[PDB]
Amino acid sequence: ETVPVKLKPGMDGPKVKQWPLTEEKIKALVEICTEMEKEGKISKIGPENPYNTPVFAIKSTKWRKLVDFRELNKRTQDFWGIPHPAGIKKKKSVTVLDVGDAYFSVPLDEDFRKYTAFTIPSINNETPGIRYQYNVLPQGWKGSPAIFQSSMTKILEPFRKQNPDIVIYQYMDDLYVGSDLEIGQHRTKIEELRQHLLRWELHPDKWTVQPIVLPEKDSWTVNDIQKLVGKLNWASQIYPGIKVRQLCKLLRGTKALTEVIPLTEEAELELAENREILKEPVHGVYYDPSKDLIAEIQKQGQGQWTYQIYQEPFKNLKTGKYARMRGAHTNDVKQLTEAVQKITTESIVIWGKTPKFKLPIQKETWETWWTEYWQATWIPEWEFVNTPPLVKLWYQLEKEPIVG
Amino acid sequence: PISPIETVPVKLKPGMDGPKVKQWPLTEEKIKALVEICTEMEKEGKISKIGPENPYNTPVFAIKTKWRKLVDFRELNKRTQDFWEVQLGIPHPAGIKKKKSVTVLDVGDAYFSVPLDEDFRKYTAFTIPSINNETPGIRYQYNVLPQGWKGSPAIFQSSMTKILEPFRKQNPDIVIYQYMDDLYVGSDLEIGQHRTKIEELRQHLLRWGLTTPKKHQKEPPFLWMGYELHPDKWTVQPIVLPEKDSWTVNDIQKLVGKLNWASQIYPGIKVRQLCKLLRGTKALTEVIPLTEEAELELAENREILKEPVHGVYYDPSKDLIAEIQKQGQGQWTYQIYQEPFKNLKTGKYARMRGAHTNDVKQLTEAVQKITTESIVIWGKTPKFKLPIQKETWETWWTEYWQATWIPEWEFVNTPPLVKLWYQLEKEPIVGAETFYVDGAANRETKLGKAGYVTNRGRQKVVTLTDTTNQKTELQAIYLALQDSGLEVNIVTDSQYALGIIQAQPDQSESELVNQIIEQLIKKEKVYLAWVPAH
Numbered sequence: 001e002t003v004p005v006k007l008k009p010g011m012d013g014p015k016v017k018q019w020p021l022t023e024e025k026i027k028a029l030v031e032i033c034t035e036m037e038k039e040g041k042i043s044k045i046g047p048e049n050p051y052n053t054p055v056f057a058i059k060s061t062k063w064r065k066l067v068d069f070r071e072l073n074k075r076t077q078d079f080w081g082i083p084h085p086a087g088i089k090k091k092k093s094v095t096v097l098d099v100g101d102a103y104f105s106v107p108l109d110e111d112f113r114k115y116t117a118f119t120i121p122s123i124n125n126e127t128p129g130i131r132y133q134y135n136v137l138p139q140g141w142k143g144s145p146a147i148f149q150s151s152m153t154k155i156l157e158p159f160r161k162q163n164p165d166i167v168i169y170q171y172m173d174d175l176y177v178g179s180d181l182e183i184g185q186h187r188t189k190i191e192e193l194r195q196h197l198l199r200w201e202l203h204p205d206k207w208t209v210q211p212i213v214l215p216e217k218d219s220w221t222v223n224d225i226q227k228l229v230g231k232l233n234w235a236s237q238i239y240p241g242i243k244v245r246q247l248c249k250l251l252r253g254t255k256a257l258t259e260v261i262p263l264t265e266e267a268e269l270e271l272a273e274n275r276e277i278l279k280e281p282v283h284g285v286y287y288d289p290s291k292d293l294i295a296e297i298q299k300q301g302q303g304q305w306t307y308q309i310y311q312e313p314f315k316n317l318k319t320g321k322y323a324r325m326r327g328a329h330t331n332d333v334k335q336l337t338e339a340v341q342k343i344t345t346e347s348i349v350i351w352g353k354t355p356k357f358k359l360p361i362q363k364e365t366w367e368t369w370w371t372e373y374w375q376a377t378w379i380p381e382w383e384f385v386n387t388p389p390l391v392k393l394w395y396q397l398e399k400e401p402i403v404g
Numbered sequence: 405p406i407s408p409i410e411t412v413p414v415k416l417k418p419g420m421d422g423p424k425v426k427q428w429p430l431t432e433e434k435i436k437a438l439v440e441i442c443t444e445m446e447k448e449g450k451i452s453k454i455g456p457e458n459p460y461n462t463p464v465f466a467i468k469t470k471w472r473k474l475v476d477f478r479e480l481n482k483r484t485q486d487f488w489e490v491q492l493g494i495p496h497p498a499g500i501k502k503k504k505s506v507t508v509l510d511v512g513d514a515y516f517s518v519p520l521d522e523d524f525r526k527y528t529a530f531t532i533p534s535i536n537n538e539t540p541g542i543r544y545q546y547n548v549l550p551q552g553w554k555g556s557p558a559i560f561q562s563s564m565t566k567i568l569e570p571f572r573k574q575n576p577d578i579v580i581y582q583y584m585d586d587l588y589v590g591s592d593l594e595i596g597q598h599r600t601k602i603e604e605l606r607q608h609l610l611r612w613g614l615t616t617p618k619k620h621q622k623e624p625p626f627l628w629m630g631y632e633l634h635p636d637k638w639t640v641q642p643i644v645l646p647e648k649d650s651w652t653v654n655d656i657q658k659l660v661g662k663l664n665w666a667s668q669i670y671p672g673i674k675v676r677q678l679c680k681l682l683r684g685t686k687a688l689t690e691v692i693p694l695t696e697e698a699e700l701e702l703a704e705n706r707e708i709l710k711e712p713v714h715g716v717y718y719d720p721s722k723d724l725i726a727e728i729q730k731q732g733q734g735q736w737t738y739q740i741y742q743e744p745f746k747n748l749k750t751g752k753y754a755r756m757r758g759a760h761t762n763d764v765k766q767l768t769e770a771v772q773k774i775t776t777e778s779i780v781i782w783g784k785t786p787k788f789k790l791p792i793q794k795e796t797w798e799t800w801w802t803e804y805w806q807a808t809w810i811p812e813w814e815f816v817n818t819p820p821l822v823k824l825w826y827q828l829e830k831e832p833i834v835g836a837e838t839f840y841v842d843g844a845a846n847r848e849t850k851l852g853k854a855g856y857v858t859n860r861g862r863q864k865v866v867t868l869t870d871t872t873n874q875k876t877e878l879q880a881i882y883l884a885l886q887d888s889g890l891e892v893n894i895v896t897d898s899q900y901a902l903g904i905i906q907a908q909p910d911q912s913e914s915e916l917v918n919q920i921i922e923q924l925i926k927k928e929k930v931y932l933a934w935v936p937a938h
């Protein structure tokens with residue numbers, strides 16, 4: 001059977017245009033689609049269907065079909081899934097499972113399929129697009145997990161019981177499984193779940209809101225103080241207790257930037273008082289479910305990226321840094337994506353929802369290649385920005401390991 | 405000769421009702437003619453005499469040499485549901501794989517060859533008048549896709565496609581391009597084999613009622629939006645600039661238009677002087693005398709255009725290469741070829757008059773439009789041949805505040821080259837003067853002052869009538885650069901300067917910034933330092 005899935009009130013279907021795809025990618029989707037077509041998951045559609053959703057392929061030599069239901073999902077009626085087990089976040093190790101395959105079984109309300117229309121492009125437009133719509137639950141649509149709920153718990157209990165020491169969290173096509181076992185004993189308990197499923201490595205507690213550390217020096221020059229004093233100023237927006245009078249007082253006059261200055265005991269105390277304030281995160285920052293969760297990333301350079309998740313300005317729910325991965329040496333876009341995906345999985349793990357990203361990159365640039373390195377079953381929301389010079393100088397100033 | 409095809413389920417927009425527009429009155433000469441045609445079409449099975457109670461109607465017209473019908477569905481159309489965008493992204497010669505042979509097939513009145521959702525027909529009702537607003541005229545409605553109806557093109561297209569799936573599967577080494585009322589069928593078979601597969605195709609088409617016509621039979625080259633399609637290469641159709649001893653505004657605009665489109669395919673076409681003539685114009689018909697200079701440039705173009713450029717077709721087994729050149733600040737030229745000198749495509753990117761950019765950036769943006777363009781055309785990315793030292797590239801990108809990237813490329817020395825016109829020092833310059841700039845302006849009175857004080861006691865303050873807050877800040881900076889030596893340290897509290905730092909632009913909109921850049925570019929070493937104000 002199938003449950004009547006309607007759109008939210010007064011909402012029409014998605015009409016997102018398919019951005020260009022590489023030949024390779026196209027040849028795959030055709031294969032992946034002809035197949036599914038036969039197996040009855042999807043059916044060719046006519047022109048009387050005006051809706052459309054972007055789709056593409058990701059990476060074995062096999063390709064996955066990734067459909068972008070962001071817009072449909074936004075317009076799909078709400079279902080008030082599974083609440084966030086505040087425990088999944090506190091677990092020595094978490095592994096994720098792709099269970100999107102699950103939905104291929106269940107049929108989809110025929111009156112709603114139209115809205116699932118998507119299109120495979122043709123190189124140079126030498127052919128019409130190949131239109132399809134779904135007959136079953138689509139991987140990527142929030143309605144899928146929700147509808148495949150009753151049936152997921154079912155297949156789930158047994159392992160939940162066989163192991164109540166482990167916690168399971170399902171988000172969209174994903175299954176986040178958490179435990180504390182030793183590696184072998186953990187990874188081995190997973191496959192036990194795998195096979196269980198087949199018949200039908202994150203370390204959360206290691207994360208933390210790293211602190212800011214001001215530079216310390218034998219000798220300080222005008223310039224130096226100006227920089228320190230500059231960064232502190234900005235920081236006062238987060239910590240009102242930070243004060244720079246006795247510091248700006250060392251800059252009273254028009255001397256060379258290079259000249260060295262002896263700090264007063266006053267200025268020295270002043271610094272000490274600030275280091276302390278920065279010793280911990282600003283008090284009072286708590287998460288609010290009813291509000292959007294935001295994520296801002298900055299290109300610190302040298303493969304370095306700083307991000308901050310927050311819902312209100314200067315009230316971070318977490319802050320971090322990310323160094324490029326071996327091999328991305330000449331590719332920003334690659335780092336950013338990985339970054340995004342990583343910040344997104346983290347986000348999900350803690351609050352069960354993807355954040356809205358403010359990406360320091362040009363739309364065009366991003367939209368072209370992002371698909372080339374993307375690897376998650378879901379897709380976050382994003383907007384493109386122009387990073388404020390200080391916001392970067394500020395977080396660049398974070399703390400790293402003594403050695404590593 | 406209609407079609408045994410399954411109709412498409414067409415609905416009217418949300419709620420809206422069928423058209424109820426009043427039938428424009430016509431003369432006996434015209435009425436008698438429309439009756440003629442409709443009786444003919446009535447026979448063919450195309451339309452239907454229908455009875456009353458079809459509140460819907462559309463105004464039929466008769467035009468000319470023999471009388472031709474012409475129903476106006478504008479309303480039916482604005483009330484008709486939306487369909488998927490009929491192919492609105494047309495190919496490009498450069499992306500076509502050459503084939504030994506190509507045949508064009510005319511599936512003209514195939515529109516009338518396709519059935520209409522019998523359930524929707526009722527809306528297509530219209531009426532042939534009597535001699536005066538006399539008695540009730542003759543009433544009909546379409547049983548097939550009507551010419552001029554919102555969904556005909558789409559549906560026809562779809563159908564044609566359904567209909568061709570068999571034949572395509574059967575003979576895959578045969579490419580069919582459905583474009584409008586034409587089927588371009590090309591292959592690598594022997595002219596005889598070809599001719600026969602075409603004839604087979606033809607027959608398979610009639611098998612579905614798509615009566616395909618020799619008098620009309622198209623032949624090469626084939627005309628396609630300014631392109632001539634020859635077997636070995638395509639070419640740009642003749643572009644003409646009409647001469648006159650008189651030119652109105654409109655004329656100079658249209659021209660400029662056409663000339664502008666040519667800049668792409670044709671190298672250095674220019675319009676600076678023609679465009680120069682549109683200044684202070686008062687009416688499109690107004691007559692502007694062409695200066696000497698414009699007369700001189702309008703001349704050269706006529707000569708550039710009188711030199712038609714051809715292009716090659718696409719060979720999948722060969723490399724995709726793209727060379728990019730800088731034809732002026734923020735202006736670029738590019739050409740994509742497989743074999744040296746046999747271009748598939750060329751083009752040029754106008755000068756985005758931005759608020760503040762740098763060449764490495766703009767170069768970067770050019771590469772992107774191109775890449776996207778190629779993906780679309782060939783479904784691949786080219787190998788780039790760019791006029792920028794791998795070091796300059798590494799040096800810039802490695803520090804820029806914004807994510808960026810260039811696909812696989814290579815350096816090529818075809819000047820001018822793109823470079824970083826200056827690089828702010830990473831640290832204060834020792835033994836170099838340090839200017840402390842500041843600027844103030846009463847945003848209201850636009851009365852301001854801007855100046856500096858150096859470590860060496862040098863000072864200055866200039867007054868500014870009709871200025872703004874930023875204009876002084878940046879001014880304070882200009883002066884400092886002006887009055888300083890080849891190496892300066894400049895400290896400012898201008899958040900705007902903070903921008904110039906992170907971006908180190910080398911071109912802008914404001915002459916002021918522009919000036920600063922000039923001084924910047926000149927100095928051997930400059931260190932910019934921002935510091936909070938107040």
Ligand SMILES: CC(C)c1c(Cc2ccccc2)n(COCc2ccccc2)c(=O)[nH]c1=O
Binds near residue numbers: 502504
């Ligand atoms: C779409 C197909 C049919 C096709 C064509 C036509 C064609 C291509 C683009 C737009 C309209 C028609 N040509 C264009 O070549 C023209 C030509 C070929 C052979 C003899 C004379 C002219 C080609 O070289 N290869 C092809 O596969």
